Structure formats: structure tokens, C-alpha cells
Design a protein around this ligand. Sequence first.
Ligand SMILES: N#Cc1c(N)ncnc1-c1cnn(CCN2CCOCC2)c1
Length: 295
Amino acid sequence: MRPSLSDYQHVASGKVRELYRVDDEHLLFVATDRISAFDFVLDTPIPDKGRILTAMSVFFFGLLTVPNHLAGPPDDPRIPEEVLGRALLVRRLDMLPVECVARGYLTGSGLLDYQRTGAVCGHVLPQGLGEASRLDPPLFTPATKADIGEHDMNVDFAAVVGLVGAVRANQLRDETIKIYTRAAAHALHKGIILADTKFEFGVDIEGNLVLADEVFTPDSSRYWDAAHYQPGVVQDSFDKQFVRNWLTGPESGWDRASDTPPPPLPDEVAVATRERYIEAYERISGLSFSDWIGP
Ligand SMILES: N#Cc1c(N)ncnc1-c1cnn(CCN2CCOCC2)c1
């Protein structure tokens, strides 16, 4: 008999994820079906999104050779029935307070920083880059969490040194770029560009660096369709473009510039979005989502 979720103590909530204490050395890392667009958690869940993203993260953890915080299999008996397939048993770590971001392509706040200053997180870039320009080598563009509801703040390497130590900062930079490079090459071979990604790491009892959180989901990474990669324009979000187009289209009745909470999504848009998640997962993993565990 699997325990109830109510047997565990809630310790943290994010926009679409939850964290529970299992015992002194283990946590339960829970993905929900909530989706975020335009910095709003939308009213409408995407069915199976939590399970699909958990499956994705597990696949990429298995692909990468680096130590990670997984502490049991996806069907570990400590996982409650209610969250089966969308929750993982993980080791409790001392988390390092750095959002470790790699960018293979220039977009979002990286592009904006570049357009304002010619530099991103201390990296002075070549002239003449623009939206969705390829960056080679990939850039380490660390950030720190800001206040509630606020965007992460881009920082330079010196800031990372000040947060975690000089040797550790070097390690975060090197591992972030190595891990991103491996995953991005794998995805591209399968027809998906991972344009960028965000990692968190923690440290175990021995002082060892351990990859934590979730890895290479479409929430932690910009997924693009490689077959439509066109430098110089904004690339479609592989997973979220239907949602974005509907919300800013004529049928939603919503004005994005108003910054009022957006309306619920059509069921059809939610189902189409689920399909995009499954497509991305199956193309990258070579597995069938119908084989992924659930309640
Ligand atoms: N992963 C991990 C982890 C760990 N293995 N040990 C200790 N702490 C953490 C931890 C603490 N906060 N967060 C991020 C934010 N949470 C994420 C999801 O739930 C919402 C909040 C990660």
C-alpha cells in the first residue's frame, strides 16, 4: 500500500510544482498539470502534463552521466497513488542559490541584455547578432531568484563566485555547459532544438555536486522545432505556441498589455497542448508515453 500524500509534510510550492518532506534525507518532487504563460499560471490544466514532464526529466537524467538527486525508481513504493507518474523520490541536498542557465541561441533576456549592452552575464559578444542567433560556444548565463512573482535577475560570473566560492563557480559553469551540450545534441538529432536550459544543483554530505530539480523539460528549457528553425525571427514554442496564440488572439477577449489574469483555455487548446508534450517526449526519448506509469 502506497502512502497518502497527506502523510508527508508540504515544504514548498512553485508555480506548477510542489515539494514534500518524506523523511530527514528524502523529498517528494511533484509536477502538477498547471501551465504558465506570460508569467501567469493559467486556470486550465493540461491533462497529463505533470506525468509527461516527469517522464522527460527521468529520461534526460538517465541520458546524462552526472550525479543527480533521484533516490528511487518512478514506481518507488514511497510515492502516493495520487501522484504516481508525476512525482519522484529525491535525496535532500544543500541547494546552491544559483540558477544555472546555458544558452545555445540568443533570445529572451539574453537577447535583450545583448541589445542594451553588447554583453550577456559578463560575456561580450560579437556584433551583428539578433533574435534566435546561434551562440557557439553555448553561454553560461547565470541568474538569481528575485522577489515573489518577479523574473530571475541575470548576473555575471563574479556574482556566482560570491555566492558559492571560486572553485565551485568554475564547476557550475563547466558542468552546466557540458550537460547542456550533450542534451542539446541529442535533441537536435531527434529534430528538436533545446535553445537554452535552466538547472539547479545542490551539494551532498560529501561535498559532491548533484544535479537536482528537473532537467530539460519544456518548462525549464525552450523547445523549438528544428525543421522550422529560422534565425532572425522569434521561434515558436514547441509546447506553448497554441496557448500563446489563442490567448493573444481575437477569441480570448483578453488584453495581454493589461496584465490582468488571463481567461481559461478552450478544452481543444488544452488537449492539443497535451499532444505536443507527448510528441516532444516520444521524439526525444524514443519511448512511448503510453508505457509511462500513472494512477
Ligand atoms: N530539487 C530539489 C531539492 C533537493 N533535492 N533537496 C533539497 N531541496 C531541493 C529544492 C528546494 N527548492 N527547490 C526548487 C523549488 N521547488 C521545486 C519544486 O517544488 C517547488 C519548489 C528545490
